[PDB]
Design an enzyme around this catalytic site. Structure first.
Site, PDB file in Angstrom:
ATOM      1  N   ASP A   1     -27.661   5.604   3.487  1.00  0.00           N
ATOM      2  CA  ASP A   1     -26.998   6.561   4.382  1.00  0.00           C
ATOM      3  C   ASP A   1     -26.237   5.833   5.455  1.00  0.00           C
ATOM      4  OD1 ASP A   1     -26.006   8.891   5.592  1.00  0.00           O
ATOM      5  OD2 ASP A   1     -27.937   9.932   5.583  1.00  0.00           O
TER       6      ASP A   1
ATOM      7  N   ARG B   1     -22.779   7.510  12.477  1.00  0.00           N
ATOM      8  CA  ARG B   1     -23.882   8.284  13.057  1.00  0.00           C
ATOM      9  C   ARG B   1     -25.240   7.568  12.866  1.00  0.00           C
ATOM     10  NH1 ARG B   1     -22.437  10.891   8.580  1.00  0.00           N
ATOM     11  NH2 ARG B   1     -23.889  10.535   6.861  1.00  0.00           N
ATOM     12  N   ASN B   2     -25.345   6.678  11.869  1.00  0.00           N
ATOM     13  CA  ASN B   2     -26.568   5.927  11.588  1.00  0.00           C
ATOM     14  C   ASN B   2     -26.525   4.452  12.057  1.00  0.00           C
ATOM     15  OD1 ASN B   2     -28.038   8.136  10.580  1.00  0.00           O
ATOM     16  ND2 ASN B   2     -27.011   7.935   8.627  1.00  0.00           N
TER      17      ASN B   2
ATOM     18  N   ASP C   1     -32.121   2.935  10.503  1.00  0.00           N
ATOM     19  CA  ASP C   1     -32.677   3.876   9.526  1.00  0.00           C
ATOM     20  C   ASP C   1     -32.305   3.566   8.056  1.00  0.00           C
ATOM     21  OD1 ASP C   1     -34.265   5.318  11.334  1.00  0.00           O
ATOM     22  OD2 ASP C   1     -32.422   6.106  12.205  1.00  0.00           O
TER      23      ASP C   1
HETATM   24  C1  LIG Z   1     -31.843   7.365  15.478  1.00  0.00           C
HETATM   25  C2  LIG Z   1     -32.128   8.539  16.401  1.00  0.00           C
HETATM   26  C3  LIG Z   1     -32.141   9.860  15.881  1.00  0.00           C
HETATM   27  N1  LIG Z   1     -32.043   9.958  14.456  1.00  0.00           N
HETATM   28  C4  LIG Z   1     -33.099   9.763  13.591  1.00  0.00           C
HETATM   29  O1  LIG Z   1     -34.242   9.598  14.001  1.00  0.00           O
HETATM   30  C5  LIG Z   1     -32.751   9.779  12.125  1.00  0.00           C
HETATM   31  C6  LIG Z   1     -31.466   9.481  11.684  1.00  0.00           C
HETATM   32  C7  LIG Z   1     -31.219   9.374  10.309  1.00  0.00           C
HETATM   33  C8  LIG Z   1     -32.224   9.583   9.342  1.00  0.00           C
HETATM   34  C9  LIG Z   1     -31.962   9.474   7.817  1.00  0.00           C
HETATM   35  C10 LIG Z   1     -33.175   8.968   7.036  1.00  0.00           C
HETATM   36  C11 LIG Z   1     -31.573  10.847   7.262  1.00  0.00           C
HETATM   37  C12 LIG Z   1     -30.844   8.496   7.467  1.00  0.00           C
HETATM   38  C13 LIG Z   1     -33.508   9.910   9.820  1.00  0.00           C
HETATM   39  C14 LIG Z   1     -33.770  10.003  11.186  1.00  0.00           C
HETATM   40  C15 LIG Z   1     -32.286  10.982  16.715  1.00  0.00           C
HETATM   41  C16 LIG Z   1     -32.465  10.795  18.117  1.00  0.00           C
HETATM   42  C17 LIG Z   1     -32.492   9.511  18.651  1.00  0.00           C
HETATM   43  C18 LIG Z   1     -32.323   8.377  17.805  1.00  0.00           C
HETATM   44  C19 LIG Z   1     -32.390   7.038  18.446  1.00  0.00           C
HETATM   45  N2  LIG Z   1     -31.713   6.920  19.664  1.00  0.00           N
HETATM   46  C20 LIG Z   1     -31.763   5.704  20.275  1.00  0.00           C
HETATM   47  N3  LIG Z   1     -31.245   5.479  21.508  1.00  0.00           N
HETATM   48  C21 LIG Z   1     -30.557   6.364  22.397  1.00  0.00           C
HETATM   49  C22 LIG Z   1     -30.302   7.728  22.036  1.00  0.00           C
HETATM   50  C23 LIG Z   1     -29.668   8.577  22.966  1.00  0.00           C
HETATM   51  C24 LIG Z   1     -29.258   8.071  24.211  1.00  0.00           C
HETATM   52  C25 LIG Z   1     -28.498   8.964  25.162  1.00  0.00           C
HETATM   53  O2  LIG Z   1     -29.104   9.916  25.645  1.00  0.00           O
HETATM   54  N4  LIG Z   1     -27.112   8.754  25.469  1.00  0.00           N
HETATM   55  C26 LIG Z   1     -26.257   7.748  24.804  1.00  0.00           C
HETATM   56  C27 LIG Z   1     -25.422   7.023  25.834  1.00  0.00           C
HETATM   57  O3  LIG Z   1     -24.675   7.933  26.643  1.00  0.00           O
HETATM   58  C28 LIG Z   1     -25.558   8.798  27.355  1.00  0.00           C
HETATM   59  C29 LIG Z   1     -26.395   9.632  26.414  1.00  0.00           C
HETATM   60  C30 LIG Z   1     -29.512   6.749  24.559  1.00  0.00           C
HETATM   61  C31 LIG Z   1     -30.170   5.891  23.654  1.00  0.00           C
HETATM   62  C32 LIG Z   1     -32.446   4.616  19.663  1.00  0.00           C
HETATM   63  N5  LIG Z   1     -32.615   3.293  20.033  1.00  0.00           N
HETATM   64  C33 LIG Z   1     -33.327   2.735  19.038  1.00  0.00           C
HETATM   65  N6  LIG Z   1     -33.638   3.677  18.025  1.00  0.00           N
HETATM   66  C34 LIG Z   1     -33.085   4.874  18.428  1.00  0.00           C
HETATM   67  N7  LIG Z   1     -33.099   6.085  17.786  1.00  0.00           N
END
Ligand SMILES: Cc1c(NC(=O)c2ccc(C(C)(C)C)cc2)cccc1-c1nc(Nc2ccc(C(=O)N3CCOCC3)cc2)c2[nH]cnc2n1
Length: 262
Positions: A126, A130-131, A144
């Site tokens: 995937d 976005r990933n 992921d």
């Molecule tokens: C990955 C993820 C998901 N998705 C899943 O879990 C998922 C994806 C794909 C699949 C498959 C299997 C279908 C492919 C399965 C599961 C959802 C939520 C968070 C994260 C996440 N976020 C991180 N950091 C952030 C996030 C936000 C901000 C924020 O608030 N910001 C950004 C800057 O500007 C201000 C606002 C700052 C830092 C991470 N750091 C290390 N790991 C992290 N994970």
């Protein structure tokens, strides 16, 4: 590595994904971590557990590092390196006033991680902006990788499901569900296009079903304004109708380094 849940502190909610809530916290009091809390019914848990050691052995500077898991409880926790700037797609769309050199650097970061996964015969399944995640220094890392395999959701796992990543899939995945290193190559070309178009949606205004049909006929993503002819040749090489005619990540990485030097 089995992390003792007493060694984790939960500090902020980072959002929701396919497996539920993700939080930001500290591990052993000092280390910044992201913690996925696997919601009940969302994952093939026993299959994930009996393979999580292989994923932990995946260690590369451009891969989001897996620190450990909490599997002696429900929800299961997946503890990784924290990436302060969140996902690449939202990051591309934001003030940054990106230069073309920075766009190629992002491609290089992703390509290095993918060449490492290819060397370990490990499929992402995937790959998309976005990933990918971005740290406080603007370094892009892929996240992921391999978790797609464990999703329990028919709308995501079926090539005709509403959540299936159709716009990042080659014809042999859409027609025959044939995943390989070459299907990750195709997804990488689409990711390069996301980067050079500054986060545009691929095949904009067309549905997943119309995209599947158009791609099978030979429609391809246009050359973005910010892509030079050399850069477009690289992302275009990822979209060959024939999987065997697509380059490997070793070749792509070498081609990206060549463009960078020129
Ligand atoms: C990955 C993820 C998901 N998705 C899943 O879990 C998922 C994806 C794909 C699949 C498959 C299997 C279908 C492919 C399965 C599961 C959802 C939520 C968070 C994260 C996440 N976020 C991180 N950091 C952030 C996030 C936000 C901000 C924020 O608030 N910001 C950004 C800057 O500007 C201000 C606002 C700052 C830092 C991470 N750091 C290390 N790991 C992290 N994970």
């Amino acid at each position: 590595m089995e992390i003792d849940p007493k060694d984790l502190t939960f500090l902020k909610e980072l959002g929701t994904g396919q497996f539920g809530v993700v939080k930001y916290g500290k591990w052993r009091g000092q280390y910044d971590v992201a913690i996925k809390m696997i919601k009940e019914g969302s994952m093939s848990e026993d299959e994930f557990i009996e393979e999580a050691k292989v994923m932990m052995n995946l260690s590369h500077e451009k891969l989001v590092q897996l620190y450990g898991v909490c599997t002696k409880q429900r929800p299961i926790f997946i503890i990784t390196e924290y990436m302060a700037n969140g996902c690449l797609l939202n990051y591309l769309r934001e003030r940054h006033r990106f230069q073309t050199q920075q766009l190629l650097e992002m491609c290089k970061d992703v390509c290095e991680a993918m060449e490492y996964l290819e060397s370990k015969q490990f499929l992402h399944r995937d790959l998309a902006a976005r990933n990918c995640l971005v740290n406080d220094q603007g370094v892009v890392k892929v996240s992921d990788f391999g978790l797609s395999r464990y999703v329990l959701d028919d709308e995501y796992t079926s090539s005709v499901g509403s959540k299936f990543p159709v716009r990042w899939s080659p014809p042999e995945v859409l027609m025959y569900s044939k995943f390989s290193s070459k299907s990750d190559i195709w997804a990488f070309g689409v990711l390069m296009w996301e980067i050079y178009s500054l986060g545009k949606m691929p095949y904009e205004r067309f549905t997943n079903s119309e995209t599947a049909e158009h791609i099978a006929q030979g429609l391809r993503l246009y050359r973005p304004h910010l892509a030079s002819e050399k850069v477009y040749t690289i992302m275009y090489s990822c979209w060959h109708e024939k999987a065997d005619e697509r380059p490997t990540f070793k070749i792509l990485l070498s081609n990206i380094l060549d463009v960078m030097d020129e």
